[PDB]
Amino acid sequence: LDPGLQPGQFSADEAGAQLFAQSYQSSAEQVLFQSVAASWAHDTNITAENARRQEEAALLSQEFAEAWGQKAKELYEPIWQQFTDPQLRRIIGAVRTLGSANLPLAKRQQYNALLSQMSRIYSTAKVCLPTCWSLDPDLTNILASSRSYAMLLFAWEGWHNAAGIPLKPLYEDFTALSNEAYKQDGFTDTGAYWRSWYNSPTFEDDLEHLYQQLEPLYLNLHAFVRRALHRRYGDRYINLRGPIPAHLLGDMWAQTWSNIYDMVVPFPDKPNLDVTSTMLQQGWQATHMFRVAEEFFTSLELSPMPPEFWEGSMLEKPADGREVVCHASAWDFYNRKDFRIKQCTRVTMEQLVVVHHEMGHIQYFLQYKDLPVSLREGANPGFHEAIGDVLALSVSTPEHLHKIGLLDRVTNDTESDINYLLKMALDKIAFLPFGYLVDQWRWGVFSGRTPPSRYNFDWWYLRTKYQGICPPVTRNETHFDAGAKFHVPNVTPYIRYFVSFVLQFQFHEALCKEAGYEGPLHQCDIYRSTKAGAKLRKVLRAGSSRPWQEVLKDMVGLDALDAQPLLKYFQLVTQWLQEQNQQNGEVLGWPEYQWHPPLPDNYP
Numbered sequence: 001l002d003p004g005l006q007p008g009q010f011s012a013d014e015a016g017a018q019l020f021a022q023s024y025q026s027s028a029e030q031v032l033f034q035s036v037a038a039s040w041a042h043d044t045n046i047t048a049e050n051a052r053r054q055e056e057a058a059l060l061s062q063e064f065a066e067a068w069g070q071k072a073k074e075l076y077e078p079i080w081q082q083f084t085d086p087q088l089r090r091i092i093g094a095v096r097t098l099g100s101a102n103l104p105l106a107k108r109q110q111y112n113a114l115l116s117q118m119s120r121i122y123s124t125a126k127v128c129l130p131t132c133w134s135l136d137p138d139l140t141n142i143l144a145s146s147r148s149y150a151m152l153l154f155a156w157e158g159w160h161n162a163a164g165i166p167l168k169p170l171y172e173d174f175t176a177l178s179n180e181a182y183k184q185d186g187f188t189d190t191g192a193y194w195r196s197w198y199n200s201p202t203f204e205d206d207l208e209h210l211y212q213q214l215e216p217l218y219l220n221l222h223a224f225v226r227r228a229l230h231r232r233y234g235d236r237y238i239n240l241r242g243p244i245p246a247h248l249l250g251d252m253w254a255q256t257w258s259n260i261y262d263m264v265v266p267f268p269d270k271p272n273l274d275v276t277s278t279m280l281q282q283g284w285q286a287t288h289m290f291r292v293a294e295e296f297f298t299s300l301e302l303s304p305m306p307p308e309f310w311e312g313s314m315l316e317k318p319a320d321g322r323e324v325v326c327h328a329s330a331w332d333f334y335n336r337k338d339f340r341i342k343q344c345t346r347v348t349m350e351q352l353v354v355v356h357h358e359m360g361h362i363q364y365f366l367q368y369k370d371l372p373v374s375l376r377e378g379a380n381p382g383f384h385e386a387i388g389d390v391l392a393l394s395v396s397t398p399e400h401l402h403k404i405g406l407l408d409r410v411t412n413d414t415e416s417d418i419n420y421l422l423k424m425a426l427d428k429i430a431f432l433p434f435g436y437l438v439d440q441w442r443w444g445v446f447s448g449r450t451p452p453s454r455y456n457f458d459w460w461y462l463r464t465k466y467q468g469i470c471p472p473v474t475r476n477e478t479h480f481d482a483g484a485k486f487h488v489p490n491v492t493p494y495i496r497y498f499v500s501f502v503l504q505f506q507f508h509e510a511l512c513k514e515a516g517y518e519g520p521l522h523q524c525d526i527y528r529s530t531k532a533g534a535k536l537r538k539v540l541r542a543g544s545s546r547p548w549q550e551v552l553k554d555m556v557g558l559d560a561l562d563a564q565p566l567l568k569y570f571q572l573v574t575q576w577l578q579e580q581n582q583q584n585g586e587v588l589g590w591p592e593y594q595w596h597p598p599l600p601d602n603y604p
């Protein structure tokens with residue numbers, strides 16, 4: 001470590017800690033920048049040499065974290081929790097947690113290389129036929145549009161085998177090293193560290209309570225869709241009292257069901273809410289999608305994207321053969337000037353929502369870029385994942401779609417309200433059990449309750465318990481199906497997305513009220529409301545300088561997560577689905593919990 005980057009001497013009191021924190025920030029932007037730059041070079045150009053430079057930059061950041069983290073612990077560990085300045089507590093509390101910098105050098109290198117190899121394996125896996133298919137776009141498009149049971153099965157099985165099986169031995173080694181590192185920071189395991197970000201002694205209980213309020217909405221949506229799959233695929237493949245086969249819901253992970261809307265739409269006389277075809281007819285490209293998302297932000301008097309964003313971002317999958325990480329992500333280079341999105345954008349309405357999701361992250365970065373780096377975060381990680389989703393709730397309304405030229409006909413009748421709210425539910429309600437269960441699985445792995453000998457046994461227990469799905473071919477412990485989901489090999493926590501999907505309806509209700517809107521919640525559009533813009537900007541400029549409970553209270557009037565706004569948004573289709581399911585005499589749930597589908601006749 002460069003002498004200029006090493007901490008000096010500071011007194012062991014609160015006044016000394018103020019100067020320590022200032023001195024830390026003055027060096028940290030440089031170190032953070034070089035690490036983001038090296039990760040950007042790798043994820044937009046996966047090569048062995050670019051992995052090697054990324055691991056070298058990671059090692060420098062670990063040296064920096066060790067020098068400052070040890071000094072902070074030595075000077076302030078007994079006392080920082082009593083400091084009068086709550087921003088100072090936030091900063092010092094972060095610096096004394098070293099994470100992987102607790103590992104000796106040889107294990108640091110092992111750790112950095114494991115992350116490199118897990119990322120390469122996930123983002124370069126292919127499914128070849130008996131010329132090979134990538135996940136994005138090839139397999140994504142098959143899962144979304146094919147209605148041949150056997151083609152869907154071939155893609156689903158092929159993807160889970162290709163990505164999961166080789167990941168398993170690396171993921172075991174990663175888990176052990178991660179736990180060894182954070183145990184030296186005082187956390188019982190890595191999962192406990194991740195849960196600490198929510199600053200709540202009752203977190204797990206509070207989540208269970210939320211899900212108990214939401215589960216009935218999921219069970220009715222589930223049974224209604226299951227009936228529809230029955231008519232299409234028949235009794236041989238669909239058990240009206242068992243789990244749904246995991247490959248038939250339009251998405252590789254069965255996490256969002258919007259791609260089978262055409263199969264379930266209650267009233268097809270009304271205007272087709274699937275506006276993708278119109279986007280194609282009109283010539284929309286990826287850059288147009290981003291410009292339309294930007295103009296919603298500026299209509300609220302939030303910031304445009306700076307020139308550095310347009311010149312630096314990767315908004316399409318490269319045509320030149322490069323291997324890249326296609327999973328959509330947003331990037332803060334910690335220099336107050338460079339901010340980018342990396343997305344293999346495809347021209348669809350669902351992707352237009354993802355564009356808003358990622359641009360919400362960049363807007364957060366723009367609004368807090370002048371805080372100290374330790375505070376350039378969301379109030380919690382759920383806040384970050386929700387910002388763009390909130391605006392896209394307004395964009396999705398048929399009224400807004402009309403205003404931007406993607407929906408021609410105009411109707412305001414109960415049947416049209418039902419089509420809209422069902423299409424939204426296929427995305428927002430279907431996701432809830434998946435957003436909840438993923439980190440239940442990972443917390444059990446980190447705690448040792450789930451050893452390698454039960455990785456897949458326990459994955460499928462939770463997938464069946466919560467989503468009511470089952471694998472369409474037989475699995476055993478050679479498979480590692482959790483590993484075939486981006487966030488597991490790329491070590492990105494997941495409970496933030498369950499929090500986000502509840503939070504975004506709390507945000508929407510508040511901003512619609514501030515906008516002066518007085519109609520049904522699900523018809524609100526906050527476009528061009530400078531008052532709603534100013535209330536959102538307060539949240540974004542706070543970063544993590546204040547407890548998320550306080551920030552939320554200012555915004556919506558309540559200091560806790562609450563499912564009632566979500567329930568109120570969906571109320572009308574909740575009632576409709578209950579009545580459809582009673583009328584058809586459905587069983588709510590999957591009491592034949594053992595059931596799996598047979599194979600197709602001469603498969604492959």
Ligand SMILES: *[C@@H]1O[C@H](CO)[C@@H](O[C@@H]2O[C@H](CO)[C@@H](O[C@@H]3O[C@H](CO)[C@@H](O)[C@H](O)[C@@H]3O)[C@H](O)[C@H]2NC(C)=O)[C@H](O)[C@H]1NC(C)=O
Nearest residue numbers: 397398399400411412413414417517518519520521523524
């Ligand atoms: C589509 O039609 C529905 C009615 O079928 C419209 O909903 C109604 O919209 C009005 C407009 O403000 C709402 O009026 C408000 O009522 C509350 C009731 O407490 C009151 O506090 C306000 O001062 C205001 O008068 C009304 O509540 C709402 N719901 C009804 C009539 O059942 C809707 O606006 C129409 N949407 C579009 C896009 O045209």
Ligand SMILES: *[C@@H]1O[C@H](CO[C@@H]2O[C@@H](C)[C@@H](O)[C@@H](O)[C@@H]2O)[C@@H](O[C@@H]2O[C@H](CO)[C@@H](O)[C@H](O)[C@H]2NC(C)=O)[C@H](O)[C@H]1NC(C)=O
Nearest residue numbers: 157161165471472473474475476477478479598599603604
């Ligand atoms: C674990 O499963 C694999 C894959 O096949 C699964 O199990 C079969 C019995 C069948 O039900 C498939 O639909 C499942 O997906 C097993 O590996 C295969 O074993 C069969 C023998 O039955 C053999 O014909 C194949 O060549 C094998 N495939 C590969 C890639 O090796 C495996 O034996 C099962 N057990 C263990 C411990 O891994």
Ligand SMILES: O=C(N[C@H]1CCS[C@H]2CCC[C@@H](C(=O)O)N2C1=O)[C@@H](S)Cc1ccccc1
Nearest residue numbers: 255327328329330354357358361385490492497
């Ligand atoms: O969050 C992200 N990308 C989105 C894009 C698709 S939509 C969205 C809502 C649904 C749940 C979740 C899903 O797709 O599984 N999700 C995403 O992953 C990125 S910013 C996560 C990330 C952060 C840092 C480095 C790398 C990645």
Ligand SMILES: *[C@@H]1O[C@H](CO)[C@@H](O)[C@H](O)[C@H]1NC(C)=O
Nearest residue numbers: 045046047048049050320322
């Ligand atoms: C990809 O990275 C290599 C280094 O391994 C570099 O030589 C090459 O120019 C890069 N390609 C692009 C398109 O940036």
Ligand SMILES: [Cl-]
Nearest residue numbers: 381493495496
């Ligand atoms: Cl999280």
Ligand SMILES: [Zn+2]
Nearest residue numbers: 357361384385
């Ligand atoms: Zn995100």
